[PDB]
Amino acid sequence: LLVPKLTASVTDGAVGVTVDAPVSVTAADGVLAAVTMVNDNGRPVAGRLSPDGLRWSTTEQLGYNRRYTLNATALGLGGAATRQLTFQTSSPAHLTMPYVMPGDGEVVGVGEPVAIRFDENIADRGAAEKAIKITTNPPVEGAFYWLNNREVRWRPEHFWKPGTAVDVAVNTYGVDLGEGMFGEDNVQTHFTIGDEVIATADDNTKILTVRVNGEVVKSMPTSMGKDSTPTANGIYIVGSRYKHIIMDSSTYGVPVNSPNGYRTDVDWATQISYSGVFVHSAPWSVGAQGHTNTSHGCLNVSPSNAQWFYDHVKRGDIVEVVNTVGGTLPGIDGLGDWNIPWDQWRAGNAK
Ligand SMILES: *C(=O)[C@@H](C1=N[C@H](C(=O)O)[C@H](SCC(=O)OCCC)[C@@H]1C)[C@@H](C)O
Structure with a gap:
């Protein structure tokens, strides 16, 4: 009925x-x-x-x-x-667009964090984190941490295991990310962790040693930062790499015309911090390399060693600098995530 x-x-x-x-x-x-x-x-x-x-x-x-x-x-x-x-x-007051790294389909090193950068400041971090779904296989615990008002990072306690698939679904379209701001769109990336590659620069020897899956494959005489502009110790994530790049001190806040400034074109440069530390070709310091620190902070090495490093090191590989007279790389540098203690990284800074 x-x-x-x-x-x-x-x-x-x-x-x-x-x-x-x-x-x-x-x-x-x-x-x-x-x-x-x-x-x-x-x-x-x-x-x-x-x-x-x-x-x-x-x-x-x-x-x-x-x-x-x-x-x-x-x-x-x-x-x-x-x-x-x-x-x-x-009815949003504003739209924010997220950008994810690393690239879709990329194979990266064991130190690569997942990165979600928004083109506007995020007032409700909690809402952003809740909109981001991370799938790992084999599954592994990780946590979000914010490097600044726009960029959040996700990673495990320890370096990834090689062969891990990582899937990142940033489901921010329609989500209120605080004070009237809504996601412009969803974005998605998927990546895989490749070989374990860790390079150590020990100031006690002035050798940069590259270890692939635990074995030494290259030993690079290097010249690091002079006592007055030392290389900060700690863990650096490999970023981008350049056949040649103009290094401009203005990029990193320092006037070229200034006393500590510079503008020089260099070869075979691998970026390891946002603060502007690179491994690069330094023909002028070949004799200092292995002996004394002469740079602004960069890991100077021979031209063939720099090119070797460009060809054999990838985004997300690790460089650890130890025993220098400098301090520690900031945890919030951009490529210094692993220097933040796990307890602090895990508890996060969403509030
Ligand atoms: C390489 O030599 C680069 C260079 N590395 C550093 C660094 O380690 O930050 C410099 S100096 C920045 C600073 O504040 O040093 C303390 C001196 C008061 C710069 C970024 C360049 C060629 O990219």
Whole structure:
């Protein structure tokens, strides 16, 4: 003797409906005979009705600042039911776009953190972290930590195991990231951890030793930072690499015209900190390399050793500098994540 029932995921009259989720309508004691959704201009949204006729759902992205009208009719054996629902979606003050590293499909070293950089300051860090789904295989515990107002990083306690798949789903579209700011879009990346490559620069020997899966494969005489501009000790993540680059001290805050400044074109340069530490070709210091520290902070090595390093070291490999007269690389450098104690990194700084 029964009347079909409709259940929609939105209510007639709702405002600030968030656009992170599809809109659905379900029939009970009947099936769906017509479902249309239309924006404020009359333009159809459309979606998919399940084969059994019980569940309809939008299949495309719904937009910010829209007024949508949903019409639905369920026919039962015991009669009909029609509903019309009109609702408004979120109206952002601003949009932020995330950027993920490392690159999709890349193979990286064991020190590569997952990085989500937003193009605006994030007022609700908690909401951002909750929108980011990380899958690891083999599964391994990790945690988020913020390097600044825009960039959050995720990593395990220890260096990744080689062969780990890492999947990163940044599901920020439709999510309120605080003070009126909503994600511009979703982004996705997937990467894999490659060989373990750790290079150690010991100031006691002035040798940079590259170890691949625990074996020494290269031993590089090096000249590090002179006593007045020493190389900071600690763990550096390998970033980008250049056949040649102009090193401009202005990039890192220091005027070229200034006393500690510089502008020099160099070869075979591998970046290991945002503060501007590189491993690079230094033909002028070949005689100092292995003996005395002469640089601004860079790991000077021979031209063939620098090119070797460019060819054999990858994004996410590790350089550890030890025994220098300098301090420790900042944990928030950009490439100094591993210098923050796990207890502190785990507890995070979302609040
Ligand atoms: C390589 O020599 C680079 C260079 N490395 C350092 C560094 O270790 O930061 C310098 S000096 C920055 C500083 O504040 O030193 C203390 C002196 C008061 C610079 C970034 C260049 C060629 O990229």
